[model samples]
Target: KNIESLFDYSAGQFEFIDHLLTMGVGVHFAALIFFLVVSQFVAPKYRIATALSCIVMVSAGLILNSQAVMWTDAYAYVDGSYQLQDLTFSNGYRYVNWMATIPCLLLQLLIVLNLKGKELFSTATWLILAAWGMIITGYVGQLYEVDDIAQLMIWGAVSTAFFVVMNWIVGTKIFKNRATMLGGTDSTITKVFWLMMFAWTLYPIAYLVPAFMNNADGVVLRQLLFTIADISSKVIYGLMITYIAIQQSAAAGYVPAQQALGRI
Candidate 1:
């Protein structure tokens, strides 16, 4: 009840919110890019399908989040909390929101699972999968009566593991592919993709570091992570849509027919 009995934290001097935002948002965005590239690179055969599925899945997360917002009937009120504040259903709020995180993991894992015969394994996919699973575990723990400090530690550990796994694969191998694309395959277009990936990676470390440290009651951390995730996702979505659009455009101009998504 009350997310483990709300306590008065007034004694803990409120830290500035900006510090939390920077790191919180950074980590979230970074993690998203990891998922995006994983889906695209894991199985070339299902690339389009996986990519589009990732989009729809994330869109559902956005819609569920919007539900929390739009479900509130009141408006024009200052300092209002929109989340349904029913005591009997407080935990449900967390579980419902958590449903979104699980789907994200599933969609990302699907790509890895399908990468049965590919170089994507250079990233230590299993380790990454385990790390994310731990994150989900940490979140689940939050819903129950668990130590706050312990939860923070678990979060930090899992997040750090996630970053380490991503950097291992993408930093070395992916950058090479990106460079190749930049040099010749499609310099301008490829550079944008690479840049988008960088943006995604930068968010989590930016946001979570402050959150773990308890800077500013962690509000800034939450808001910033969500914001980075929200904005970068939009940017990447637009870039990908453009990629598909142009591919179809060129195919229609010279090929036998317009390119269809999910072609083997």
Candidate 2:
């Protein structure tokens, strides 16, 4: 007789939890807005790509991130009929967003690559490339583009290849010379900034780990992990955009190389 008597069934207290759970959507909506607003004011070195990516990400998050909540709720049903209560799917927008994620990711990858080494193009060139990548991938032909499995694979491969090439360059250039940069007083704020940057620098692992670990129970675990990932990604994505904007504000003296040249 030790049932513990949780979640008082009589007075409908559990509905509060259900209603409270729905607030995730609002949190996500607010987070995306903040990301977009903050990214706009960042210095140009990081402003365009960061702002564009944040906008794309927030749009995708609002449309697509709800999939996890629905899926998780379906799992909670005791009957196990794969039915969700009051559920609706945005097939049109879903595919629209699924299609958009490819180039948003690609633009982000290009920006990351441009940041890694002294490439031939100037920062403006890189920004232009990134801007166009976002446009072609998300804005221009998103409605008409064919988003088949093969196209998804193609973009996945492209992002993966870019990441690998970037890693090779960084392994030899940055990691190999870590001692020169580390252990210096770049300020506690600067230290935190780099730490956050370094953490984002490793986000590829989140995708890679799931690819190799795909069994049944593992798949269930992946769902759980992905829900956590969704929430974490939204929260961090929002904070990072805001944080970088603040950093750019503080470091107004550090003009971007492209801006410096253009002033001439």
Candidate 3:
């Protein structure tokens, strides 16, 4: 049911997918170094989110690297289009990567928002559960995407159920934390959370693309959407958390951050 096997993709499709996937790898690894280095000026306590960013970036970068390699090796260029040369090419690696990374990505909220004790533990649990539930269901749905729309609908709906609750939990927690954050940083966090939500929506949209446009071009769009979502949720979202940390650190008069901010 891997629709990737069903289509004969032009050279442009092959080139585009290869470039986009490889570029995502580059961006994630490059972002990791910046996250680690800039984290130095963030307050010691607030640095947890930045540290998580490094973890997320490194893991995502490496997984994407593997995926890009798998992609090219799975297809053989013949004539004007690519043909499936390996039956072993599975996109399941992405689900595996998400299973590992998304939880950590959400967990950064606890650090950045400074949730503590009982609330922290409880929120973390909910976040992890919802994330896995969402991802696993979507994965199952994606398996049936090319072969069975019924299965896609069933699992996709189930995944959407988890997604609904996940956002609810996140929005409530983030808004509560907003009241606790410094001046402008509070609303800035809120806006970025909204951005995260928007970006994540693209994933399910990509998942559904096989329903309507399961062709070579649709494949390209789907992969493109996935990369865009990945960059946003992992890279952009993590950097925003780092930015919040730096801003709040400056407000708290953390000396290193102040020196960097020229406020000292």
Candidate 4:
């Protein structure tokens, strides 16, 4: 009898969640394949880092899918909208995903951007912390009751500030530091950074959808928006980084390790 109050696990009410997970897994493999192919063409010095990023990207996706299943399968829903318990939404798994993958995403860029020594460690630490801050603040924002929209926006603003700082670091600091060395690839990486910023900007808007629309439909809307954002941020963004690696490798006259070995 106590269990009934805690959860309402009606079967198949949210199979869309599982379906989305399947799609995400497939996309993750596609991204991994892209990474593998690009890694082969890049300089040997970068091959290991590229492969490592792909591994992390794939692992993050599977873990995210597993969390999706656990939450959607176990949670209670009323009238097709998630029912809250203890004032928490059924979306904590999303933050878990961000926490795991956002760092990998930043690491991928850091690898290709190739910062060294003090600048490298400092930038990496700042980006990872900023990404965590953004996600955690957003997670806190979503915990607010539906009526507490003002409180949500306050947290949302905090997360957005972190997002802006991330972009500033990429646009101003990274670009300024590497511009001379990267040449055409500098423009490419900058474009990818801005593209990701545009996608990320949509997240706060999507997060606030329930408040703005005054409807429960925001649950589905938010999921859909986040799904697209994940694809763009991870898969597409990874591809752009691969492009940068290839361009930079060619510019530096980097030869494939296997080819170099065969020549000797």
Q: What digit string (tens of lDDT, one per residue) describes model 4 on residues 70-159? A: 655555667765543443325556677778777777776777777767987899899888888999998888777264778788998999
Q: Model 1: per-residue lDDT, tens digit, 1-264? A: 222124222222112222333343354445446546544332243344335435644553454344334322212123432222332212234334434543443333333222334544534455456445645554554443223555555665665565565445434443454433311323444454465466555444443433354433453344455455545544454344334333433333523212333352
TM-score of 4: 0.79
Task: Give candidate 3's total backbone clashes.
Answer: 0
Q: Highest lDDT, which number?
A: 3
RMSD of each: 9.3, 11.4, 1.5, 5.3
**Candidate 3 lDDT, 131-216, residue by residue in tens:** 89999999999899878999999999999999999999999999888888873788888888898789999989988888989788
Q: Where does candidate 3 stray beyond 4 Å?
A: none
- lDDT string for model 2 (182-234, tens) is 11312322333344345433333333322444333333343344344445544
Error of 2 at 51 (Å): 1.8
Candidate 2 minimal-lDDT segment of 10 residues: 1-10
The candidate 1 region of ten consecutive residues with least summed lDDT is: 7-16
What's the lDDT of the predicted structure labeled candidate 4?
0.69
Q: On a 0 to 100 scale, what is the lDDT of residue 19 in model 2?
A: 38
Q: Candidate 3 clashing pairs?
A: none
| Candidate 4 clashes between residue pairs 3 or more apart in a chain or in different chains | none
